[PDB]
């Protein structure tokens, strides 16, 4: 008659398939830790009913809007159910790459030069001031929706005349899009668990960038944990990530993506407040290097909830 835990997984975002896999692993991991957990997919079950269904606490293993963007957190707060990860504001902010970037820049943290566009602006036609700002970024650029994950809607632009094609793709996924200076890399990601910063991971895609195929389907993506940074470079990275996490107001756990550029400086890409939790995901990889099994990790994430 101890706590009944709902593992929310699946949902209706572009990251549904990834989330099914995250939730599958989290479910088994929690049960291995002695937690009485059950899978609940919001696509199939009305989550407004969780309290009436007898659940006491919620492990969020959803990715994307509908699960990660503060909407669900809002509902759970009013239902009075404790839940894992960041609260309403920090979840909403971390989902919005445009506003994450603004906040980080306001805080004096390093971000890639960028231009933001609304769908209305793109349809009105780009102004001469806009084409100028875009041209100043140089080529290549990367184009992303503001509010996606798993590299959904993203592409690399290598010729001026194909910027429009990259924008049309990103606008299939959001009403606000970012065009960012291309960063040389290498690429890193840093997981956070409570007040601990976990070992950084260096990510080496076999193709152009860390796209959906490289993240979930390829056996050619290479990871390094530890990341191979000199001790002080690692300390610098961890300090940057902590300041970026605290600036957004995040809590519980998450994962922040960072790249070096040609100037030798680290640049923040985004924060993820409900990161991948498949067996082969990066938060589990960093936690493993820090001495935690997958089950110990999910138990710890749940313990951190409200």
């Amino acid at each position: 008659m101890t706590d009944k835990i709902a593992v929310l997984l699946g949902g209706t975002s572009a990251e549904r398939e990834v989330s099914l896999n995250s939730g599958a692993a989290v479910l088994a991991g929690l049960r291995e830790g002695g937690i009485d957990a059950y899978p609940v997919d919001p696509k199939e079950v009305d989550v407004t009913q969780l309290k009436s269904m007898g659940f006491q606490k919620v492990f969020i293993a959803l990715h994307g809007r509908g699960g990660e963007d503060g909407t669900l957190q809002g509902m759970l707060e009013l239902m009075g159910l404790p839940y894992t990860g960041s609260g309403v504001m920090a979840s909403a902010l971390s989902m919005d790459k445009l506003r994450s970037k603004l906040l980080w820049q306001g805080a004096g943290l390093p971000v890639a030069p960028w231009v933001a566009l609304t769908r209305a602006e793109f349809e009105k036609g780009l102004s001469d001031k806009q084409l100028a700002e875009i041209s100043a970024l140089g080529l290549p650029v990367i184009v992303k929706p503001s509010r996606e994950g798993s590299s959904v809607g993203m592409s690399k632009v290598v010729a001026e005349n194909a910027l429009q094609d990259a924008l049309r793709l990103a606008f299939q996924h959001d009403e606000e899009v970012l065009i960012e200076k291309w960063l040389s890399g290498p690429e890193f990601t840093v997981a956070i668990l409570g007040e601990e910063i976990l070992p950084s991971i260096r990510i080496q895609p076999s193709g152009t960038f860390y796209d959906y195929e490289a993240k979930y389907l390829s056996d050619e993506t290479q990871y390094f944990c530890p990341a191979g940074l000199e001790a002080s470079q690692e300390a610098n990275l961890q300090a940057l990530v902590l300041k970026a996490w605290t600036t957004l107001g995040c809590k519980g756990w998450g994962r922040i993506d960072v790249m070096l550029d040609s100037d030798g400086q680290f640049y923040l890409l985004e924060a993820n407040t409900s990161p991948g939790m498949t067996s082969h995901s990066l938060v589990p990889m960093a936690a493993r290097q820090a001495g935690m099994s997958f089950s110990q990790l999910v138990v710890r994430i749940l313990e951190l909830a409200d």
């Binding site: 008659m1 101890t2 009944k4 049960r31 002695g34 009485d36 957990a37 059950y38 007898g54």
Partner: peptide
């Protein structure tokens, strides 16, 4: 309810 961990 029938639970994964019976009792508790």
């Amino acid at each position: 309810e029938n639970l994964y961990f019976q009792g508790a």
